[PDB]
Amino acid sequence: SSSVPSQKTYQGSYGFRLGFVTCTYSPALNKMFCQLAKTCPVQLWVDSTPPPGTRVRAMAIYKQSQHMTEVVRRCPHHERCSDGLAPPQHLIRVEGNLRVEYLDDRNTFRHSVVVPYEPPEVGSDCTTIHYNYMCNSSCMGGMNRRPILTIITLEDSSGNLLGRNSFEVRVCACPGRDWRTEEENLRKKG
Amino acid sequence: SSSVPSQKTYQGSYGFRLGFVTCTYSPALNKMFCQLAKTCPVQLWVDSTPPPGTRVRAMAIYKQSQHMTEVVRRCPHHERCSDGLAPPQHLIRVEGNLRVEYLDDRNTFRHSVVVPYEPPEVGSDCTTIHYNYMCNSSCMGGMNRRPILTIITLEDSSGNLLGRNSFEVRVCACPGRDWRTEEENLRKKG
DNA sequence: CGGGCATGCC
DNA sequence: CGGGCATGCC
Ligand SMILES: *C[C@@H]1C(=O)C2CCN1CC2
Ligand SMILES: *C[C@@H]1C(=O)C2CCN1CC2
Ligand SMILES: *C[C@@H]1C(=O)C2CCN1CC2
Ligand SMILES: *C[C@@H]1C(=O)C2CCN1CC2
Ligand SMILES: C[C@H]1C(=O)C2CCN1CC2
Ligand SMILES: C[C@H]1C(=O)C2CCN1CC2
Ligand SMILES: [Zn+2]
Ligand SMILES: [Zn+2]
């Protein structure tokens, strides 16, 4: 009945974890600082191999309680101003994948983007998905300065939740500057 | 052949001049500082009475040479987020008038808004048009921090130019602050 | 690149 | 209200 997706970490029976200029990641804040329309690799780590047909879904949610029930969408300006697959209303794109699906949920109206889970090749320890955020956090008529989380869910082909992780995202012009400011504020005022 | 409207002051044979918290006007800068979607009265002054059927047209133009040939439009966000007469692409509206016309020029693509010239009633010395700017100067995908001029033209019913005046506009959140900053910068660095 | 400005907002 | 913050940009 809820149209608000869960954000609670569930690393699950497969031991699902995420792994991480243009962008910088803060472990202390569990927060990515990146620039708009520049791809950000996110690593998928598992302790046990997921079943064939496992899928990886990404969905944004507003972090603040007062905004959590509002669907995160691309702002009207960047909707108007395009890879031929992503609907222009979607904030999060996946690059570098031939089986990307974009979902507009018919009941919750939430956007998500899904790709097949590919196990690491023999010799490799993780797999990478190239995400792209098509607005700044500040975009008027879109995120409008409200922080988001990206929720990454590992799902089997039947729809079962296998694992869930999330990280906060700030899409901004100056990731290094803004990261330093936020880490300093955490230490001084958090 | 030109699609760039003239901005040169032409007070003309009728002695046409303009006359002038929510907003403040700087004579030194010939510049209105106002807030978005809040009406701004502009006074029309004439030395001689224009003929019956005279019209008053308002049109925005970018002030900077590198932007002058781009049509000034409402940004996509405020286009989407409405008095039932103004097309949502138009930046400048007129309130308080029953004969407002909105023009999208079929050749130049420029927007303008026109009302009848009404002579001041017996006892009055000027007439007022209530303009409304539907974006901030800063709006992404619209003016995008580029200053505009508003060009007010007094035209007879045949289309003859009777007079022309202009003023710069900054639509902003804090007109009083921004006016003081710009006047100070004129004195210190102009 | 990075310090400072420009500007909606707290 | 007004000083200060938040943030794309110079
Ligand atoms: C944005 C940065 C990078 O360069 C890679 C991918 C995402 N983060 C962490 C590692
Ligand atoms: C995490 C994995 C690896 O083991 C190497 C380096 C980064 N990714 C892809 C290959
Ligand atoms: C914005 C201010 C006002 O209060 C009136 C109309 C426009 N300016 C000058 C006078
Ligand atoms: C300029 C005119 C006048 O003479 C009075 C005061 C302001 N407007 C309208 C009436
Ligand atoms: C802050 C941001 C900028 O404004 C440029 C480009 C990348 N960052 C440093 C210099
Ligand atoms: C600057 C602007 C604001 O932020 C509020 C409203 C009007 N001005 C003063 C206080
Ligand atoms: Zn945007
Ligand atoms: Zn706007």
DSSP characters for B60-92?
Answer: EEESSGGGTTSPP---HHHHH---SSS-TT-SE
Residue nearest to nucleotide C8 (CA to C1'): B173
B38 sits within 7 Å of strand C by its CB? no
A119, A174, B4 from A145: Cα distances, Å: 36, 14, 36
Q: Which domain holds residue A119?
A: 1-190
Distance between alpha carbon A165 and the CA centroid of its chain, in Å? 9
To which H or E segment does residue B183 belong? helix B175-189
To which H or E segment does residue A133 belong? strand A127-133
Ramachandran class of B84: left when φ > 0, alpha when ψ lies in -120 to 50, beta otherwise: left
Structure tokens at A115: 């790709």
Contact indicator for A161, A155 with CB cutoff of 8 Å: yes
Residue B112, C-beta contacts closer than 8 angstroms, at least 6 positions apart: B57, B58, B59, B92, B102, B103, B105
What resolution does the deposited structure have, in angstroms?
Answer: 1.6
Cα–Cα distance measured from residue B174 to residue B176, given in angstroms and rounded to the nearest whole number: 6
B77 sits within 7 Å of strand C by its CB? no
Classify each residue of A18-32 as buried b or exposed e, where b means 16 or more C-beta atoms within 10 Å of its C-beta. Answer: beeeebebbeebebb
Method: X-ray
Strands A161-171 and A31-34: parallel
Cα–Cα distance measured from residue B161 to residue A183, given in angstroms and rounded to the nearest whole number: 61
Cα–Cα distance measured from residue B113 to residue B148, given in angstroms and rounded to the nearest whole number: 16
Structure tokens at A145: 């300065």
Cα–Cα distance measured from residue B179 to residue B27, given in angstroms and rounded to the nearest whole number: 11
Contact A121 CB / ligand 2 (< 6 Å):
no
Question: What is the distance in A from the centroid of ligand 8 to the CA of B171?
Answer: 10
Please state the domain count of chain A: 1
To which H or E segment does residue B179 belong? helix B175-189
Number of neighbours of residue A92 by Cβ within 10 angstroms = 22
Cα–Cα distance measured from residue B76 to residue B181, given in angstroms and rounded to the nearest whole number: 29
